[PDB]
Every structure is written in C-alpha cells, then in structure tokens.
C-alpha cells in the first residue's frame, strides 16, 4: 500500500491456472477472466464481481449498482 492507498499483489508461478478470485484467473488468455463463482462466464462487470462478496456476522451487504452520474 503506497502513501496514496494503492494495493498490489505479486503471485508466483506455481499457481498457474489455479487462482480464482477477483483479479481473475491466472492464464495466458485475456478474454475468459470474467467467470462467475458458479463456473459460468458473463460480460457484465457487476454481475461478475458481486458473486465474490463475503459477509461476516454483523456486516450484511446488498447488491451493488453502477453509479448513475
């Protein structure tokens, strides 16, 4: 994390074609990295990225929507 608040992660080789999270699967092809948690593929960013939310007791979350501005 910088002074500005920018995040960065650097993974290794032994996780090729195995990572699954929001930074997308780790593969050479750059066209199939919006696969939802159910295993299917979509095109909508928010439909893809609302499937990876985590809830923890007190904190409950709704469905996020793109800003209309």
């Amino acid at each position: 994390i910088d002074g500005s608040g920018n995040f960065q992660v650097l993974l290794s080789d032994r996780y090729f074609n195995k990572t699954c999270g929001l930074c997308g699967n780790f593969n050479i092809f750059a066209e199939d990295d919006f696969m939802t948690q159910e295993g299917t593929l979509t095109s909508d960013p928010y439909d893809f990225a609302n499937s990876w939310a985590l809830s923890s007791g007190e904190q409950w979350c709704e469905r996020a929507s793109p800003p209309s501005s």
Binding site: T36, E38, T40, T42, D44, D47, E62, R63, S65
Partner: protein, 116 residues
C-alpha cells in the same frame, strides 16, 4: 342510487363532486387516499415486473396511494423498493438469487434482471 347518476354523467365527460361529510363518503381504509381520478396503470407491484402489457384506462375515483409508493400483495401500501418480484407463476422476495441450469436471475427493485 345517487352514485349511479354520477357514473352516468362521467361517461359524458361531466365531473361532479356531490360528496360531503354527511353522505356516503367512501370510508377508505387507512394508509390510502380517496383522491379523485388517478389513472391506474400502476399502484400494483405486478405492474413493475410486467411493464409492457397495456396502459389505456379512464378515470375511476378509487382508493389510491401517495405518489411515491406502491401497494403490497396482502394490501398494505407502505413499500417503495420493498415489494416483491413476480416470476413464472411464483412470487419471490427482495434481494433473492437463483440459478437452475439455463439462466441466472436475481431481482432488484420490482423487476427480475434474468440473464443468460
């Protein structure tokens, strides 16, 4: 007998009040408004899930709700974006998800947003 005449007049365009405290005023249930013509093509949460069926209605003098709200299935008119979603026969609930084998559907506001 009085209201039959008033209804006959309205078919010819004449609007008339004829109702005062001391006669048969509609005694509308609480949470609703007696207000005159309100062109009902909404005020039911069904109309939100099916937005493309029809809208050609005349004036009716019914019970309605303030212009920010909708009526619930069981009869209350409190909800705004708290009222359920309708789908192929069934009835779902705000913030629900399901995925059988073909489609992925959730429901935000009063509509579905099925994909696939």
């Amino acid at each position: 007998a009085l209201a039959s005449y008033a209804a006959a007049c309205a078919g010819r365009g004449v609007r008339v009040a004829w109702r005062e405290p001391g006669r048969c005023e509609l005694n509308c249930p609480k949470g609703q408004v007696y207000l005159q013509c309100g062109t009902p093509c909404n005020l039911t949460c069904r109309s939100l899930s099916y937005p493309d069926e029809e809208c050609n209605e005349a004036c009716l003098e019914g019970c309605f709700c303030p212009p920010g709200l909708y009526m619930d299935e069981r009869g209350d008119c409190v909800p705004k974006a708290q009222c359920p979603c309708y789908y192929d026969g069934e009835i779902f609930q705000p913030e629900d998800i399901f995925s059988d084998h073909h489609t992925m559907c959730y429901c935000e506001d009063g509509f579905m947003h099925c994909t696939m």
